[PDB]
Amino acid sequence: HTRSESSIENFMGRAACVYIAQYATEKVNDELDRYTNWEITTRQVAQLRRKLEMFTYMRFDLEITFVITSSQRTSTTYASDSPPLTHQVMYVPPGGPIPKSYEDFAWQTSTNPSVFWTEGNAPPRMSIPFMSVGNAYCNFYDGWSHFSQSGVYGYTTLNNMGHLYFRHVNKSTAYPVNSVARVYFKPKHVKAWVPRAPRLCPYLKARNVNFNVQGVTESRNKITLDRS
Amino acid sequence: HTRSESSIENFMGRAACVYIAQYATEKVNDELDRYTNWEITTRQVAQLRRKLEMFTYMRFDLEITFVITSSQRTSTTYASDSPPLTHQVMYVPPGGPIPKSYEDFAWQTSTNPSVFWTEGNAPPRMSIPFMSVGNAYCNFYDGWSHFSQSGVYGYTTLNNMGHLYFRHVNKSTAYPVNSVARVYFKPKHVKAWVPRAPRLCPYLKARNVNFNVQGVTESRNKITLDRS
Amino acid sequence: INYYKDSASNSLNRVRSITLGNSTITTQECANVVVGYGVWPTYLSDHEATDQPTQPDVATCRFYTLESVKWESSSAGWWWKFPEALSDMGLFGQNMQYHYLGRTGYTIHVQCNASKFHQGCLLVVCVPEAEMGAATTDHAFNHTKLSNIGQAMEFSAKKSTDQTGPQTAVHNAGMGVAVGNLTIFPHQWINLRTNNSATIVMPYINSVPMDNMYRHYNFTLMVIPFAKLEHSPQASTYVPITVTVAPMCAEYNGLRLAGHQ
Amino acid sequence: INYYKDSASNSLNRVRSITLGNSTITTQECANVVVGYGVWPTYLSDHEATDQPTQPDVATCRFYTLESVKWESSSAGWWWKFPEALSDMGLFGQNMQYHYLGRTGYTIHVQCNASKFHQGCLLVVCVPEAEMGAATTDHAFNHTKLSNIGQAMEFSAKKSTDQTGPQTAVHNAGMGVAVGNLTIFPHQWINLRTNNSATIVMPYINSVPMDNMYRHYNFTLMVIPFAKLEHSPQASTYVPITVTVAPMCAEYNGLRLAGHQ
Amino acid sequence: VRSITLGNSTITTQECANVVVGYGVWPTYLSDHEATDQPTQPDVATCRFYTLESVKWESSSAGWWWKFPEALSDMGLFGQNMQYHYLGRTGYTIHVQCNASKFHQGCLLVVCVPE
Amino acid sequence: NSATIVMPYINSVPMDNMYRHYNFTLMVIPFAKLEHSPQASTYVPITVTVAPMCAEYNGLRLAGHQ
Amino acid sequence: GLPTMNTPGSTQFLTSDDFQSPSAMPQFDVTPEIQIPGQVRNLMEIAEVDSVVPVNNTEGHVNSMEAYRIPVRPQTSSGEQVFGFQLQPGHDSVLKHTLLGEILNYYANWSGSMKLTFMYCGAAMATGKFLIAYSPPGAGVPGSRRDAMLGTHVIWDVGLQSSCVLCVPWISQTNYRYVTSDAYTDAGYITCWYQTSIVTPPDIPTTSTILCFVSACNDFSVRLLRDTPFITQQALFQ
Amino acid sequence: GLPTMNTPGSTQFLTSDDFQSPSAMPQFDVTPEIQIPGQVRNLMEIAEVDSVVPVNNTEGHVNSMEAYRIPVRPQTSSGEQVFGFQLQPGHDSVLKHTLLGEILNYYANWSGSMKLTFMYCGAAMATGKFLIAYSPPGAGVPGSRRDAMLGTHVIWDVGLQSSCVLCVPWISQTNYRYVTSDAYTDAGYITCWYQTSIVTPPDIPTTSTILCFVSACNDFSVRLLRDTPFITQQALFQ
Amino acid sequence: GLPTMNTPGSTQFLTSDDFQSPSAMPQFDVTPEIQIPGQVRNLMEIAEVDSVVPVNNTEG
């Protein structure tokens, strides 16, 4: 009975979705934006969050895979012949310059790690090492950002990993096409510390530990069993 | 604290865009030309230029990757069925014969290194060694081309690497399609000499060190801080 | 066989007296002393750096006594946040204002006695990084409602409706968990049948070697009754609970003017 | 494991007297002599080739004195371009016209004295390959406005509007950088409080072993005051700065008729 | 020229001129023969150079005086340890500094009178 | 231009309460008065920089000093 | 070059794959690991730790602290039941939300001996004996103390010791049991019975409290990792 | 042939990848490398070199040489401030455009001791003492010499030496601080205070100049290479 | 099989590439090489040989 599936690296070492980015080819709405950004966080999906927040301190190494799938926008005609779409994901480090719009020259970088992908190939994956200014990743920070105990209470000040910027490399399509990129995180080389109680109440936001009140366990009829 | 990201080879050894070539399938305008040329220079993008011009003398080896993406021209109809486009990049050495037009026989070479690429595959990369008649690449040349101190003042006389010629191998498409090839340079085996001050004023052209006047640092209110 | 040169690119690895300075505590019948996560609070090593770390050994590592709290029948529980409850405590708190960073371990000694004719059970637990949620959601709370200067913040039996306070429902521990699962944190049960006290020695638990001891509560001490205090009405009524904390191997750095703005 | 046979296809590698000929300088109180980028100017080795290199040792390596310049209150700074400021200098410049290629090191000795009641600070720096920008953009400048024959070209405090000159704004150094960042180039600060002189020995810095010494200024010597010269009005007013350069291990090749057309 | 470091503090200028040490005795800690619990010695956080308020030297200046350990009363963590403790014991290193040009004149007497 | 005196602990007892007994005083007395030319600088300041050396304490109680 | 041949299973994304990947930030200097107390190398070392069981979960007791308090009191006829729950860790709504059950719910199999620790939080002058039995599944659940004495039991006297330990053994017909239990692999029944009574002197309150704790022994093991059926979100948490 | 299987991450272009590639000009004879003075093997050896700090950047002083000149003069009340700036290398608009800050702006992390060299460019007959303090972040910025003497300071007499060195140590709660600074990792405050005065003989100008230089010590280090947020171009430079 | 990963630069035709290729006529018996005078191993050995220069190239 080797406890192989109960180790930390078998528990956390599995790909799980963390963000679903949506971007189009035509800026029909402000929301698609023709490109999309995402500050890196692991508090937006409940299933990876409850795995992460059983421990106060983590030291996980990371692997990031994207599953980009495209689909045509609903118009009156759809007959066209287009070359295959090329996607670009540019990891912007914290504090670096961001693209202000499409057709900017921040996408033609010189130090930002970027990746390209044509539709039909294997899903592109990249690895990101331990990105911290300390000795662990703090899943819970019980304090404030300012020295006068004001501003921001929570783990948000210590979660500073950067941005992911998604765009289409192709300039134009003859009919607009919406792309959906699903970011998948796979922890590796994971070292954990200070085990925490598992979360009972379902989450409410992404930047705090706020909750609504719940009972500890769903109820039963009596306290005793009765049958022959 | 191993200074690993502060070495020269980690600093310069990253792909960065240096030129964005544009060419079409139909010569709608003189500019597309149905093909396009580019004399090799690294003074057209600011981000690689400021990395290069911290040193007076470089000896970098080179790797050149292209990201060619195509997109249909705006017409009234778009329904077609075309075989995949094949692109050709022919590196012409300095002094060699150039193609005068499309359908020329200079594209069917015998010594010029060329590469072919069908859309949908991996981006094509090639390597170019240290291309110089001297012992270093001079980022700054403080002198003239002629012995009588006339003609050309600057680094342009010592920047002689050749041309890149982009074209479509396919003869005709049933509707015109514009291709955008983004050249990416990745230095390697880099040896630097004589460190220069980092550039303050933003650049103005590509063949000189001309600038407009700027202040050394954006200003503040007072010279002293005042709070308890 | 590894293909790359970076480790991000690899694959997975598949009776008894306790004296501190001029202070002593009693009664301990050689019953139980819980030490942290198996770690005794020691001084920092030389591998973690960084000038000269200041260690006022005898004049600081001593037993400070807080204000006592009343254990009634309808008491949900209380909590203190350290190093904020030892803020105005002797020369421990004078060294906090004059220094930038700090580091300390503890030995919390909670004491609550009663007769042989009483009953009730306490849970004395030490939760590190007890990030509390909001009572009113989408509205951040003030720091004074989390922890005052050495003042015992109490829980509640029902949900709160405070706009700028923490959620003080005691069966959810103020955090978002079940309160019955709080035994993984270092703790000791006070049973009025057989214990009458609890002593836990806590080491320094953080992700950094040192930390500014104003804008980060390193851990909290929750005292939650699980079995409520019932006694005969002709017995004694006032049953007080007293918390006696002492720092252990306190270090500081970054000597400047007195804080903490 | 390498797959290819060409190295382009690999992966990344992840009081005191100084005598030169019949010339000596004074005063030097054994203060400071800066030598280049750590390299003393020597003759060329046999690995760099290419007939017989001509080395007129004693008749050329000597201290030439340029024209003195006035240090006023509103002086922005000056610059000289070598080997163009030693053009009409003895037998150094006669060997430049008769030869195709040349190679030389230097020892620039800038000297500027004042009383104990003066103040002001100079920066004597040696910038190699100081490619200057245009004053009026998209209009190339003449070579006479860059460097005349041994004549001190001066900076300006404001921007220029010359159509065929360099941009002489002194806080941008005429190059496109901040003038405060000029300390990476080999230099020495003249402080009128404690220095009164500056001596820098410069080696041959180029990307080729030899070079034609007419169409390429190998380096420039900028003298920029950072603290302006202030004195009492009853003191002495004329404070001159004098530049004394000597070549070191000068070599030549390519003997033909006298240039330089 | 000569630097004297105490904690995170240094003084200048001293041209290796003169340092007077007491009545020939350097201030050390107390021995075990004099008693009396545990003596508290905050070495680095207290033994540091505190700077007082400057005083104007005019023509008609008679002189000034300070009384120690009363002039270091509100001085950092030296004075916080004075209130919380009954007894104390300390040595000193007083560094009085007053500069002028070559065209000035005048002579000061910096003396340390006990009791 | 300066003066530096290192003073030991001088008392008749090994320790002493540092509120009700000034252990020593520092007198700064000019013997030759400061004369300068009227066109020179006028404000000549004197600055006292004291550091304790090997400070010890005993008798830890509540904060004094009544 | 080397002639290759693509086997089926290429160019896919198995989400539980173990493959290398090119790094985004190469030659990155990671800050050094240090000593932090309480390093967990395995999820079973969390399930070793006890946690008090909400046995009294009869609504509305689950919204307060009273769900953890089992009420005992003097009786008029000995041999009656105090509590009793089906031994379905991860599925029975008594100890599914405990520290053992919330770890078990991330899996689909479990195998090992469980340990129940009880603690009498009564008066110091109060005494009495309890029979804490465990009956293997069979047929069926016992309905009396005379019936639930024929299996595995301990007789806990609260005068001698305040804490008892009932180590529930692994008596099964398989190697593993499912977390989401069914009729195939039942695990049995835990009950508690008044052995004699609760005998107090006067001036003592008539109602007391027993807490019950659950943990896992050294032979506990899990298998077949899955998603937990507790948290349900619809959109991304903003 | 050899049966292969494409893992995810194939046929992509990671811009920081390290892969071999076929050469365009094979068997090419490279001209030999020679001795050129001043070979730089590391960007930190540039940040070792001092560079004078534009402390007096109060507009319109930044368009002239006066931004590098800190004006000192005789005083009427001792103990006043000369200059003071927040220690944000790469972010504070005093030394961000220096040689250390322009190298730091290509990164997102920094860790090491900084060294400040000051130089009094006054008359040779002029003297005086300065207090150059450094207060760790804490709370807050000091507002007097009596407040900014309780941290780390040096007392520089300009009669003895014309240059002083204030080595700002690394006293932080992390391993690294960000270049684009925030409230999480402050680095402290540099100030300068008049210790006594500036005492000159007659026939000396009443205003002098101190220059301030910044560099990096041997424990300086950087991390997380990125793009610099200074240069912004729109189209290709022609 | 063996998990591979396509790097950029695959499925292209660099015209100065050096790659092996399957033969069209396998096991082919080549006729033997013999002694022929004047084997040239290098183009510089041709440039060693003198050739008379048309110096008087003034039309016609």
Author numbering:
A (entry chain A), B (entry chain A): 57 to 284
C (entry chain B), D (entry chain B): 30 to 43, 82 to 117, 120 to 330
E (entry chain B): 82 to 117, 120 to 198
F (entry chain B): 265 to 330
G (entry chain C), H (entry chain C): 1 to 238
I (entry chain C): 1 to 60
Article sentences:
Human enteroviruses (EV) are presently classified into four groups, Enterovirus A-D (EV-A, B, C, and D), among which EV-B, the largest group, consists of over 60 serotypes, including all 6 serotypes of coxsackievirus B (CVB1-6), coxsackievirus A9 (CVA9), over 30 serotypes of echoviruses and more than 20 newly identified enteroviruses. The capsid proteins (VP1, VP2, and VP3) adopt the classical eight-stranded anti-parallel β-barrel configuration with the N-termini residing inside and the C-termini exposed on the surface.
Superposition of the asymmetric units (protomers) verifies the similarity in capsid structures of the F- and E-particles (RMSD = 0.4 Å in Cα atoms). Evidently, empty particles with virion-like antigenic features are of considerable interest for vaccine development.
